[PDB]
Amino acid sequence: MADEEKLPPGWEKRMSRSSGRVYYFNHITNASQWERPSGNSSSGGKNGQGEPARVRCSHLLVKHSQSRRPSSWRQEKITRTKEEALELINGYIQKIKSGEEDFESLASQFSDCSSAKARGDLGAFSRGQMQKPFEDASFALRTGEMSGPVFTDSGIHIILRTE
Numbered sequence: 001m002a003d004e005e006k007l008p009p010g011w012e013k014r015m016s017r018s019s020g021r022v023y024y025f026n027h028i029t030n031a032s033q034w035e036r037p038s039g040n041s042s043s044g045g046k047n048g049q050g051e052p053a054r055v056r057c058s059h060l061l062v063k064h065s066q067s068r069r070p071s072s073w074r075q076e077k078i079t080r081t082k083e084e085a086l087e088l089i090n091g092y093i094q095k096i097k098s099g100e101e102d103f104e105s106l107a108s109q110f111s112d113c114s115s116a117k118a119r120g121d122l123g124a125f126s127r128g129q130m131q132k133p134f135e136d137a138s139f140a141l142r143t144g145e146m147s148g149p150v151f152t153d154s155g156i157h158i159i160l161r162t163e
Helices: 082-094
Strands: none
Touching: none
């Protein structure tokens, strides 16, 4: 079995030893964890389908060589390739999921673009505005859980998610 009837909008309780205690696996964000998208705070919603109202999510970008912005926000050089660039993303995953830092110290103080200047240099759109690879996954959840390693024209993006 792979379902439930007592959880927030998103993630599906599996626990079928498909990795290591999937504990609610999101088919949209493709992320895993041992805690629902709320953590003793708020998990309301469950209205439509990823379109509760808006998203106004951010993006870390963090692009590498051969792309668009071959330069860091603090530095001024980039050579690492896609693979080597993937590691740069994990940094905002294992560290963020350390119950230490919040979701306001990754894209605001780290981002290979304008994002690393105004916290979230992305804004809200609600599909249609952005590109394909910036709507579906970006529609997952509706609070700020962030999805796995996505794929966008520039860099890779991690979708911080806010609303």
